[PDB]
Amino acid sequence: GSFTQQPDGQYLLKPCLSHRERDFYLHIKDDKEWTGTGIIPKFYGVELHEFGFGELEFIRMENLMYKYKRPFVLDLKIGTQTWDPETASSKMKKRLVVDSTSTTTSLGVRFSGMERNIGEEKPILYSRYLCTHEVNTRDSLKEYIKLFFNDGKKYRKELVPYFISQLDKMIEVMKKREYKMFSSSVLFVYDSTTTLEDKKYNCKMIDFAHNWILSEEECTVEDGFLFGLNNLKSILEDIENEFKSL
Ligand SMILES: O=P(O)(O)O[C@@H]1[C@@H](OP(=O)(O)O)[C@H](OP(=O)(O)O)[C@H](O)[C@H](OP(=O)(O)O)[C@H]1OP(=O)(O)O
Ligand SMILES: Nc1ncnc2c1ncn2[C@@H]1O[C@H](COP(=O)(O)OP(=O)(O)OP(=O)(O)O)[C@@H](O)[C@H]1O
Ligand SMILES: [Mg+2]
Ligand SMILES: [Mg+2]
Numbered sequence: 001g002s003f004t005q006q007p008d009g010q011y012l013l014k015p016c017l018s019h020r021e022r023d024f025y026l027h028i029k030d031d032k033e034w035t036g037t038g039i040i041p042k043f044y045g046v047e048l049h050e051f052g053f054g055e056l057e058f059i060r061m062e063n064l065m066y067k068y069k070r071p072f073v074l075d076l077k078i079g080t081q082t083w084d085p086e087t088a089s090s091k092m093k094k095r096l097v098v099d100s101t102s103t104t105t106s107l108g109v110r111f112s113g114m115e116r117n118i119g120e121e122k123p124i125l126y127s128r129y130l131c132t133h134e135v136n137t138r139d140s141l142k143e144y145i146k147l148f149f150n151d152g153k154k155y156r157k158e159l160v161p162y163f164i165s166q167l168d169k170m171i172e173v174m175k176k177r178e179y180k181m182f183s184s185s186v187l188f189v190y191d192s193t194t195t196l197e198d199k200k201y202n203c204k205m206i207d208f209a210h211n212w213i214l215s216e217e218e219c220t221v222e223d224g225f226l227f228g229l230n231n232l233k234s235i236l237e238d239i240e241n242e243f244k245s246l
Contacts, residue, residue, distance in 0.1 A: 075112035080224025108228025111135035118152030157243035166203035
């Protein structure tokens, strides 16, 4: 929402509309478990750029799809609720309904949108709003994730282990419960023209505008973030199992 959402430059320069995302990146900046594990985008720093009468703060981070020729993108929103203690009351009826009619309250993960580039471009776009109808069960979420790995010619079963390995690293850090994250996503991307060796594939946690730093502030409500990651991992392992029958 804060920038035109589509990437073949090196960077994303994301505006700071509140303190939370920038406080989080600054806080994990020296923690090798966040920054050497490859589980969040490479953080270049917070920067001031001219805006209005003065300056606006931005986060400079890596563009995860830099130099991708045929990008495939899947965004999965993580947690058992997508509201937090600061959510506006006028948004709450909708947040409550979407959380309960999607897989969010049951699995702690929900479909958020997908793009597949199968040579016939324009790309095929799958709306985030599919989550309360077409992708509203574990079985249908599994089918759409399989579809992400369908490059238009075959299932890219060889990429799935990378994705599980990434989720393992996320699980290991989030077990420590230093942060609560609401409305954050795991972004899965790959270039369908990649080989394994080219390493044009990525799996990162993103969007930290509603992150709470538990050593600094109270946040009583639960995020269910670790429950969601565990469920998503379990779905990917099911997919590995299912892709052997091919
Ligand atoms: O957070 P998302 O992606 O699910 O979508 C946001 C919408 O939520 P929904 O998907 O309708 O539950 C969200 O709707 P709400 O008004 O927050 O219910 C907005 O449309 C938001 O755009 P912005 O922050 O107003 O610029 C939308 O943000 P962007 O998709 O534009 O980032
Ligand atoms: N580092 C990145 N590289 C490539 N794509 C990204 C990156 N970060 C975000 N995106 C893409 O841009 C979309 C929007 O990003 P994000 O949700 O972080 O910001 P926002 O919607 O502008 O603001 P808010 O933090 O209020 O949601 C993501 O859903 C994802 O598709
Ligand atoms: Mg947004
Ligand atoms: Mg967002």
